[PDB]
Amino acid sequence: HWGYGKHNGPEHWHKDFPIAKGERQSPVDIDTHTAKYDPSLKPLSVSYDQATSLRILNNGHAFNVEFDDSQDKAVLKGGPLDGTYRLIQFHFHWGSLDGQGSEHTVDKKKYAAELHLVHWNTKYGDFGKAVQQPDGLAVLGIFLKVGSAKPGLQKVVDVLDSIKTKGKSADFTNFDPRGLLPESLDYWTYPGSLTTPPLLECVTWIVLKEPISVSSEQVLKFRKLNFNGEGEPEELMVDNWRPAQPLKNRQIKASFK
Numbered sequence: 001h002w003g004y005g006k007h008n009g010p011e012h013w014h015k016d017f018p019i020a021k022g023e024r025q026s027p028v029d030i031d032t033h034t035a036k037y038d039p040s041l042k043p044l045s046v047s048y049d050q051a052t053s054l055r056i057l058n059n060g061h062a063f064n065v066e067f068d069d070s071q072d073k074a075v076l077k078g079g080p081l082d083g084t085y086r087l088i089q090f091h092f093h094w095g096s097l098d099g100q101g102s103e104h105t106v107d108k109k110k111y112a113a114e115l116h117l118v119h120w121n122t123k124y125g126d127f128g129k130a131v132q133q134p135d136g137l138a139v140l141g142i143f144l145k146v147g148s149a150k151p152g153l154q155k156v157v158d159v160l161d162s163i164k165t166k167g168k169s170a171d172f173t174n175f176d177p178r179g180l181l182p183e184s185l186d187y188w189t190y191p192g193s194l195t196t197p198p199l200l201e202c203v204t205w206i207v208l209k210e211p212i213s214v215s216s217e218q219v220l221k222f223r224k225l226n227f228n229g230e231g232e233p234e235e236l237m238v239d240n241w242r243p244a245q246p247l248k249n250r251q252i253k254a255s256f257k
């Protein structure tokens with residue numbers, strides 16, 4: 001029964017999910033002065049040429065664009081990662097206004113939204129096994145600021161009216177997630193967790209330094225989605241972000257000087 005409200009929001013998650021107070025929780029504030037350049041990191045390899053999107057689903061907390069991950073089509077490799085991570089879905093977190101919405105922050109700055117491209121380590125064979133491992137997932141995080149429209153985001157924006165409420169889905173084939181990437185792949189990386197229950201500590205985070213720009217009209221349409229199911233009292237899907245968590249005994253590394 002968790003969600004984002006007063007009564008069921010991030011401050012309450014620890015009661016059903018005690019790992020909420022664990023040692024490697026996400027998101028975190030990225031203090032740009034404290035993150036150390038690690039000349040040993042690699043260039044990330046984002047290989048999305050063969051990506052096969054299938055469906056888009058309003059799950060009551062966000063919407064997921066789902067991919068065929070039955071074999072190695074769209075994969076993330078390199079950077080801080082060992083081995084091959086298959087793209088399974090992407091989704092966003094966003095705010096009620098442009099001044100909040102991201103989960104990670106940069107020197108305490110909140111972006112209007114944050115995209116997460118979720119990938120799982122194929123050495124564990126399936127996603128449900130991968131989330132039980134400390135190196136099971138790699139989530140590529142991309143900040144959104146409001147300015148010029150992002151042309152590669154418009155197909156997502158235009159299907160949202162058809163999945164307004166929890167449990168609705170729509171066919172969503174042939175979507176190219178390369179159109180959501182910024183120009184630079186410079187990133188910060190640290191070990192963390194899923195940012196929604198069950199909050200599993202299984203994620204290598206890779207957060208791109210360069211935000212993408214989306215238009216105010218684009219993000220306004222995210223904010224017309226609903227957390228509720230069909231016919232239920234309307235609760236706009238906004239502010240579905242978890243705040244920054246304590247860094248504890250972790251190091252955030254930069255891939256760039």
Ligand SMILES: NS(=O)(=O)c1ccc(C(=O)NCC(F)(F)C(F)(F)C(F)(F)C(F)(F)F)cc1
Nearest residue numbers: 116118127128131139193194195196197198200
């Ligand atoms: N915001 S995020 O950090 O990018 C992010 C990315 C992905 C998930 C996600 O797959 N939750 C769903 C889930 F994994 F928890 C799961 F239900 F599928 C599960 F596999 F653990 C379970 F519970 F065993 F079935 C959550 C947060």
Ligand SMILES: [Zn+2]
Nearest residue numbers: 091093116195
């Ligand atoms: Zn997320």
